[PDB]
Tab-separated table of N, CA and C in Angstrom:
chain	number	residue	atom	x	y	z
A	1	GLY	N	5.977	-8.435	-13.226
A	1	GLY	CA	5.412	-8.930	-14.285
A	1	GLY	C	6.217	-10.143	-14.839
A	2	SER	N	7.323	-9.782	-15.362
A	2	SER	CA	8.424	-10.716	-15.604
A	2	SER	C	8.891	-11.767	-14.749
A	3	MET	N	9.093	-11.522	-13.552
A	3	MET	CA	9.042	-12.344	-12.503
A	3	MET	C	9.417	-12.026	-10.852
A	4	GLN	N	8.030	-11.433	-10.874
A	4	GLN	CA	8.024	-10.814	-9.372
A	4	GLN	C	7.888	-11.678	-8.395
A	5	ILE	N	8.962	-11.701	-7.612
A	5	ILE	CA	8.953	-12.932	-6.645
A	5	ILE	C	8.086	-12.470	-5.466
A	6	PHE	N	7.497	-13.716	-4.833
A	6	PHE	CA	6.920	-13.510	-3.423
A	6	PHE	C	7.402	-13.219	-2.168
A	7	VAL	N	7.260	-11.896	-1.436
A	7	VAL	CA	7.703	-11.808	-0.458
A	7	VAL	C	6.807	-11.380	0.928
A	8	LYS	N	7.102	-11.548	2.103
A	8	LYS	CA	6.306	-10.955	2.956
A	8	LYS	C	7.044	-10.143	4.147
A	9	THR	N	6.555	-8.933	4.110
A	9	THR	CA	7.172	-7.829	5.107
A	9	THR	C	7.058	-8.112	6.494
A	10	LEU	N	7.855	-7.794	7.218
A	10	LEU	CA	8.039	-7.807	8.603
A	10	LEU	C	6.449	-7.721	9.174
A	11	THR	N	6.012	-6.647	8.922
A	11	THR	CA	4.463	-6.391	9.043
A	11	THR	C	3.441	-7.428	9.099
A	12	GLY	N	3.053	-8.139	7.472
A	12	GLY	CA	2.596	-8.591	7.253
A	12	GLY	C	1.984	-8.753	5.795
A	13	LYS	N	1.922	-7.613	5.417
A	13	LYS	CA	1.449	-7.221	4.040
A	13	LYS	C	2.188	-7.964	3.034
A	14	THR	N	1.486	-8.227	2.107
A	14	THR	CA	2.623	-9.165	0.941
A	14	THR	C	3.246	-8.145	-0.009
A	15	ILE	N	4.438	-8.447	-0.529
A	15	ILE	CA	5.054	-7.591	-1.604
A	15	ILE	C	5.419	-8.237	-2.688
A	16	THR	N	5.277	-7.523	-3.999
A	16	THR	CA	5.727	-8.377	-5.068
A	16	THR	C	7.120	-7.592	-5.519
A	17	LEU	N	7.711	-8.032	-6.363
A	17	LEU	CA	9.014	-7.429	-6.873
A	17	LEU	C	9.400	-8.394	-8.011
A	18	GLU	N	9.524	-7.682	-9.068
A	18	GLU	CA	10.134	-8.342	-10.407
A	18	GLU	C	11.693	-8.251	-10.511
A	19	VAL	N	12.322	-9.331	-10.971
A	19	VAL	CA	13.519	-9.504	-11.341
A	19	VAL	C	13.875	-10.277	-12.008
A	20	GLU	N	14.927	-10.498	-12.926
A	20	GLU	CA	15.337	-11.228	-13.919
A	20	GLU	C	15.932	-12.579	-12.981
A	21	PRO	N	15.206	-13.828	-13.464
A	21	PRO	CA	15.511	-15.012	-13.221
A	21	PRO	C	17.094	-15.124	-12.694
A	22	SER	N	18.021	-14.891	-14.294
A	22	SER	CA	19.263	-14.947	-14.138
A	22	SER	C	19.927	-14.406	-13.236
A	23	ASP	N	19.381	-12.829	-12.733
A	23	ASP	CA	19.961	-12.277	-11.686
A	23	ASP	C	20.354	-13.020	-10.252
A	24	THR	N	21.505	-12.632	-9.811
A	24	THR	CA	21.867	-13.728	-8.786
A	24	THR	C	20.876	-13.374	-7.551
A	25	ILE	N	20.771	-14.407	-6.663
A	25	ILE	CA	19.947	-14.441	-5.579
A	25	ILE	C	20.317	-13.299	-4.555
A	26	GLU	N	21.604	-12.989	-4.159
A	26	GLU	CA	22.129	-12.162	-3.441
A	26	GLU	C	21.237	-10.654	-3.956
A	27	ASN	N	21.510	-10.610	-5.241
A	27	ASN	CA	20.901	-9.282	-5.802
A	27	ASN	C	19.817	-8.991	-5.887
A	28	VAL	N	18.884	-10.035	-5.924
A	28	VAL	CA	17.554	-10.107	-5.880
A	28	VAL	C	16.852	-9.502	-4.377
A	29	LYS	N	17.578	-10.325	-3.519
A	29	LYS	CA	17.349	-10.093	-1.911
A	29	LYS	C	17.613	-8.766	-1.720
A	30	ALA	N	18.938	-8.081	-2.016
A	30	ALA	CA	19.506	-7.014	-1.494
A	30	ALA	C	18.216	-5.706	-2.307
A	31	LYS	N	17.686	-5.998	-3.378
A	31	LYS	CA	16.647	-5.128	-3.703
A	31	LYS	C	15.647	-5.030	-2.503
A	32	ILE	N	15.340	-5.938	-1.908
A	32	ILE	CA	14.197	-6.279	-1.156
A	32	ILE	C	14.504	-5.320	0.024
A	33	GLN	N	15.970	-5.068	0.105
A	33	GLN	CA	16.274	-4.156	1.304
A	33	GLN	C	15.786	-2.739	0.887
A	34	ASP	N	16.041	-2.337	-0.545
A	34	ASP	CA	15.655	-0.882	-0.961
A	34	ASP	C	14.030	-1.014	-0.976
A	35	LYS	N	13.467	-1.964	-1.061
A	35	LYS	CA	12.050	-1.936	-1.077
A	35	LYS	C	11.596	-1.736	0.090
A	36	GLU	N	12.211	-2.188	1.607
A	36	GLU	CA	11.573	-1.954	2.659
A	36	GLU	C	13.088	-1.729	3.476
A	37	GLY	N	13.845	-2.628	4.040
A	37	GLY	CA	14.901	-2.298	4.816
A	37	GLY	C	15.425	-3.380	5.814
A	38	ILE	N	15.601	-4.889	5.063
A	38	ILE	CA	16.049	-5.811	5.907
A	38	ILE	C	16.980	-6.683	5.360
A	39	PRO	N	18.000	-7.091	5.755
A	39	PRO	CA	19.472	-7.530	5.287
A	39	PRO	C	18.877	-9.059	4.522
A	40	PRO	N	19.505	-9.395	3.305
A	40	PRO	CA	19.165	-10.118	2.301
A	40	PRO	C	19.380	-11.770	3.053
A	41	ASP	N	20.118	-11.883	4.042
A	41	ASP	CA	20.205	-13.042	5.023
A	41	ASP	C	18.902	-13.343	5.699
A	42	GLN	N	18.491	-11.979	6.284
A	42	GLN	CA	16.953	-12.300	7.004
A	42	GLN	C	15.836	-13.138	6.032
A	43	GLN	N	15.955	-12.494	4.638
A	43	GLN	CA	14.702	-12.995	3.933
A	43	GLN	C	14.909	-14.424	3.843
A	44	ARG	N	13.825	-15.323	4.022
A	44	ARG	CA	13.868	-17.052	3.840
A	44	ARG	C	13.313	-17.209	2.351
A	45	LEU	N	14.331	-17.887	1.785
A	45	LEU	CA	14.015	-18.532	0.571
A	45	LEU	C	13.384	-19.743	0.451
A	46	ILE	N	12.332	-19.666	-0.673
A	46	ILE	CA	11.277	-21.009	-0.561
A	46	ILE	C	11.205	-21.269	-2.044
A	47	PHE	N	10.832	-22.414	-2.140
A	47	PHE	CA	10.440	-22.907	-3.346
A	47	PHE	C	9.433	-24.129	-3.094
A	48	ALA	N	8.372	-24.142	-4.252
A	48	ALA	CA	7.251	-24.834	-3.951
A	48	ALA	C	6.705	-25.293	-5.186
A	49	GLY	N	6.780	-26.361	-6.085
A	49	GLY	CA	6.174	-27.053	-7.243
A	49	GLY	C	4.710	-26.916	-7.535
A	50	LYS	N	4.047	-26.282	-8.522
A	50	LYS	CA	2.520	-26.426	-8.567
A	50	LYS	C	2.294	-26.217	-10.049
A	51	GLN	N	2.432	-27.586	-10.605
A	51	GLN	CA	1.961	-27.448	-11.800
A	51	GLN	C	0.466	-27.507	-12.151
A	52	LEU	N	-0.107	-26.460	-12.881
A	52	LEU	CA	-1.397	-26.321	-12.751
A	52	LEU	C	-2.157	-27.344	-13.382
A	53	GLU	N	-2.477	-27.997	-12.620
A	53	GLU	CA	-3.301	-29.816	-12.928
A	53	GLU	C	-4.609	-29.230	-13.622
B	1	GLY	N	24.321	-26.836	3.942
B	1	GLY	CA	24.789	-25.813	5.156
B	1	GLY	C	25.045	-24.665	4.907
B	2	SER	N	25.957	-24.358	3.702
B	2	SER	CA	26.158	-23.171	3.210
B	2	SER	C	24.985	-22.390	2.828
B	3	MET	N	24.065	-22.977	2.461
B	3	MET	CA	22.962	-22.157	1.837
B	3	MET	C	21.810	-22.722	1.530
B	4	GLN	N	21.474	-23.690	2.246
B	4	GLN	CA	20.408	-24.985	1.947
B	4	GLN	C	19.018	-24.088	1.956
B	5	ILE	N	18.444	-24.087	0.651
B	5	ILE	CA	17.292	-23.290	0.430
B	5	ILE	C	16.403	-24.302	0.952
B	6	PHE	N	15.148	-23.791	1.197
B	6	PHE	CA	14.210	-24.085	1.832
B	6	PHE	C	13.088	-24.396	0.692
B	7	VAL	N	12.465	-25.907	0.444
B	7	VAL	CA	11.823	-26.236	-0.543
B	7	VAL	C	10.701	-27.448	-0.130
B	8	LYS	N	9.419	-27.168	-0.670
B	8	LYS	CA	8.614	-28.089	-0.602
B	8	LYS	C	8.184	-29.181	-1.654
B	9	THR	N	8.079	-30.382	-1.318
B	9	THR	CA	7.945	-31.390	-2.337
B	9	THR	C	6.281	-31.463	-2.610
B	10	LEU	N	5.938	-31.493	-3.960
B	10	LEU	CA	4.630	-31.627	-4.371
B	10	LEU	C	3.974	-32.715	-3.359
B	11	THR	N	4.660	-33.779	-2.786
B	11	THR	CA	4.075	-34.740	-1.914
B	11	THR	C	3.603	-34.069	-0.703
B	12	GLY	N	4.562	-33.364	-0.067
B	12	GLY	CA	4.524	-32.602	1.346
B	12	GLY	C	5.696	-32.505	2.105
B	13	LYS	N	6.364	-33.247	1.946
B	13	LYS	CA	7.708	-33.594	2.696
B	13	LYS	C	8.508	-32.561	2.486
B	14	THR	N	9.180	-31.997	3.498
B	14	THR	CA	10.174	-30.687	3.377
B	14	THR	C	11.329	-31.332	2.919
B	15	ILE	N	12.024	-30.584	1.938
B	15	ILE	CA	13.404	-30.719	1.160
B	15	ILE	C	14.591	-29.640	1.446
B	16	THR	N	15.658	-30.046	1.680
B	16	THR	CA	16.793	-29.049	1.858
B	16	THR	C	17.695	-29.243	0.820
B	17	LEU	N	18.374	-28.165	0.499
B	17	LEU	CA	19.199	-28.170	-0.904
B	17	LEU	C	20.070	-26.963	-0.699
B	18	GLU	N	21.566	-27.186	-0.505
B	18	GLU	CA	22.686	-26.185	-0.616
B	18	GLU	C	23.097	-25.557	-2.292
B	19	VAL	N	23.307	-24.542	-1.950
B	19	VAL	CA	23.548	-23.695	-3.159
B	19	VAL	C	24.089	-22.460	-2.626
B	20	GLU	N	25.040	-21.892	-3.789
B	20	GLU	CA	25.797	-20.766	-3.428
B	20	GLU	C	24.768	-19.616	-3.703
B	21	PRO	N	24.791	-18.241	-3.081
B	21	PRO	CA	24.015	-17.351	-3.169
B	21	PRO	C	24.138	-16.585	-4.431
B	22	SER	N	25.213	-16.663	-4.490
B	22	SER	CA	25.958	-15.995	-6.142
B	22	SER	C	25.127	-16.833	-7.431
B	23	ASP	N	25.312	-18.049	-7.177
B	23	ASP	CA	24.391	-19.013	-8.162
B	23	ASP	C	23.222	-18.651	-8.746
B	24	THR	N	22.947	-18.205	-10.033
B	24	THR	CA	21.782	-17.670	-10.949
B	24	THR	C	20.717	-18.477	-9.897
B	25	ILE	N	19.465	-17.703	-9.851
B	25	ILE	CA	18.147	-18.371	-9.424
B	25	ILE	C	17.545	-19.789	-10.262
B	26	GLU	N	17.746	-19.348	-11.609
B	26	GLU	CA	17.298	-20.285	-12.550
B	26	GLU	C	18.071	-21.415	-12.504
B	27	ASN	N	19.480	-21.658	-12.061
B	27	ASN	CA	20.317	-22.632	-11.692
B	27	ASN	C	19.889	-23.316	-10.526
B	28	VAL	N	19.629	-22.549	-9.609
B	28	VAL	CA	18.970	-23.014	-8.482
B	28	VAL	C	18.028	-24.025	-8.593
B	29	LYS	N	17.030	-23.613	-8.946
B	29	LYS	CA	15.694	-23.835	-9.353
B	29	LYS	C	15.970	-25.311	-10.090
B	30	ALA	N	16.829	-25.133	-11.023
B	30	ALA	CA	17.187	-26.282	-12.183
B	30	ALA	C	17.647	-27.521	-11.289
B	31	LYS	N	17.962	-27.306	-10.100
B	31	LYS	CA	18.760	-28.290	-9.558
B	31	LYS	C	17.814	-29.121	-8.573
B	32	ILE	N	16.591	-28.337	-8.456
B	32	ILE	CA	15.603	-28.942	-7.672
B	32	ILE	C	14.949	-29.837	-8.656
B	33	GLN	N	14.977	-29.653	-9.971
B	33	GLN	CA	14.450	-30.406	-10.821
B	33	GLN	C	15.020	-32.176	-10.479
B	34	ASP	N	16.572	-31.749	-10.678
B	34	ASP	CA	17.477	-33.583	-10.373
B	34	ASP	C	17.189	-33.779	-9.161
B	35	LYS	N	16.667	-32.754	-8.256
B	35	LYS	CA	16.524	-33.374	-6.697
B	35	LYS	C	15.060	-34.082	-6.651
B	36	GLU	N	14.438	-33.562	-7.685
B	36	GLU	CA	12.832	-34.477	-7.968
B	36	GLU	C	12.462	-34.795	-8.804
B	37	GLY	N	12.244	-33.404	-9.938
B	37	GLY	CA	11.499	-33.651	-11.159
B	37	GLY	C	10.729	-32.677	-11.642
B	38	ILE	N	10.759	-31.399	-11.240
B	38	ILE	CA	9.854	-30.329	-11.493
B	38	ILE	C	10.366	-29.045	-11.967
B	39	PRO	N	9.649	-28.476	-13.017
B	39	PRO	CA	10.245	-27.367	-13.896
B	39	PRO	C	10.413	-26.135	-12.720
B	40	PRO	N	11.486	-25.441	-13.140
B	40	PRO	CA	11.905	-24.330	-12.105
B	40	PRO	C	10.793	-23.227	-12.193
B	41	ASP	N	10.143	-22.812	-13.149
B	41	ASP	CA	8.829	-22.205	-13.143
B	41	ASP	C	7.923	-22.475	-12.183
B	42	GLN	N	7.699	-23.712	-12.142
B	42	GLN	CA	6.459	-24.136	-10.927
B	42	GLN	C	6.990	-24.049	-9.846
B	43	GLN	N	8.364	-23.951	-9.173
B	43	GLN	CA	8.904	-23.795	-7.787
B	43	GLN	C	8.487	-22.320	-7.587
B	44	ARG	N	7.904	-22.268	-6.587
B	44	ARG	CA	7.588	-20.600	-6.059
B	44	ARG	C	8.259	-20.066	-5.078
B	45	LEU	N	9.074	-18.930	-5.796
B	45	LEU	CA	10.031	-18.077	-4.840
B	45	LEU	C	9.267	-17.465	-3.933
B	46	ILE	N	9.821	-17.278	-2.621
B	46	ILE	CA	9.396	-16.539	-1.618
B	46	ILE	C	10.584	-16.100	-0.592
B	47	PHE	N	10.228	-14.892	0.018
B	47	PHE	CA	11.293	-14.367	0.923
B	47	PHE	C	10.775	-13.611	1.840
B	48	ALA	N	11.275	-14.034	3.229
B	48	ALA	CA	10.646	-13.440	4.475
B	48	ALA	C	11.780	-12.999	5.325
B	49	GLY	N	11.722	-11.626	5.874
B	49	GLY	CA	13.175	-11.384	6.755
B	49	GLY	C	12.443	-11.626	8.338
B	50	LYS	N	13.703	-12.161	9.016
B	50	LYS	CA	13.302	-12.800	10.392
B	50	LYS	C	14.540	-12.293	11.178
B	51	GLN	N	14.788	-11.443	11.388
B	51	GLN	CA	15.990	-10.908	12.239
B	51	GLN	C	15.878	-11.332	13.849
B	52	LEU	N	16.679	-12.289	14.171
B	52	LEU	CA	16.250	-13.051	15.334
B	52	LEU	C	16.389	-12.146	16.293
B	53	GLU	N	15.177	-11.258	16.846
B	53	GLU	CA	15.234	-10.455	18.006
B	53	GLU	C	15.424	-11.270	19.227
């Protein structure tokens, strides 16, 4: 809820994971490992602006 | 090259931006502003594992 990052599991199902924005990217990705089991490097980082017009 | 994050501009064209993994997520997104001009909150964060099978 605070900052649930959007992620896609190898299988396909969508996955949510809350983490502080200030928290280092490496740390955030590392949690995804615990969440499933995939190296942080593998996770593809993506950004997209969407100003709710 | 070091860690060019994947981003998609409001227009559509793809954008690349290198930033240290350790660097705070908020700081990383903030640069995207300088890169174009969009609030960090607007940028959608995404992660996807892809082990080069």
